[PDB]
Ligand binder design. Structure first.
Ligand SMILES: Cc1cc2nc3c(=O)[nH]c(=O)nc-3n(C[C@H](O)[C@H](O)[C@H](O)COP(=O)(O)O)c2cc1C
Ligand SMILES: [Ca+2]
Length: 169
């Protein structure tokens, strides 16, 4: 219950990643939530937060998330450790590949969120992305279940390892 996984999902992908993630961390470690059925209180509740957001319709944010953003910007993230994950399509929307991860970064970083979990952009092949920490790493875990589902298992296995460390446990 140290970690609170909050996801948005429209066709189920991010919802599954969240669940693989919690499996890997374990239950007494983290609880998963559908941001759509979540509240401010529900988010402020945890100290370590994992936020999952898939990018929709040309750089936009999954609507459950889009609509929660205002509440999101009311939360003081100062004193909190966050990580970010999401889903994207690097071949049909290569020019907005996981931009949503970037939008949720901007809408939380100034708020004092201590972000963790940058992921190497090695192995992906998008044309552009607004969710990059540096131009060799996304700001979070980018999962492409549409084009690279075969790499989804390992990406999560390794990324969760990576965050477990950065967070310490
Ligand atoms: C019409 C349409 C627009 C989309 N636009 C984007 C986009 O701008 N960025 C991106 O990387 N993925 C884009 N995607 C792909 C989704 O983010 C991807 O399918 C993701 O796995 C969906 O996760 P969800 O099931 O959790 O919503 C789009 C998908 C569709 C069908
Ligand atoms: Ca493929």
């Amino acid at each position: 219950a140290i970690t609170g996984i909050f996801f948005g999902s429209d066709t189920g992908n991010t919802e599954n990643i969240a669940k693989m993630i919690q499996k890997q961390l374990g239950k007494d470690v983290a609880d998963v939530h559908d941001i759509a059925k979540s509240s401010k209180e529900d988010l402020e509740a945890y100290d370590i937060l994992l936020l999952g957001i898939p990018t929709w319709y040309y750089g936009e944010a999954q609507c459950d998330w889009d609509d929660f953003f205002p509440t999101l910007e009311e939360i003081d993230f100062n004193g909190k450790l966050v990580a970010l994950f999401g889903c994207g399509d690097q071949e049909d929307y290569a020019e907005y590949f996981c931009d949503a991860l970037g939008t949720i970064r901007d809408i939380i970083e100034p708020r004092g969120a201590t972000i963790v979990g940058h992921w190497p952009t090695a192995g992906y092949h998008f044309e552009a992305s607004k969710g990059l920490a540096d131009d060799d790493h996304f700001v979070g875990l980018a999962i492409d279940e549409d084009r690279q589902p075969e790499l989804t298992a390992e990406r999560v296995e390794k990324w969760v390892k990576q965050i477990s460390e950065e967070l310490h446990l």
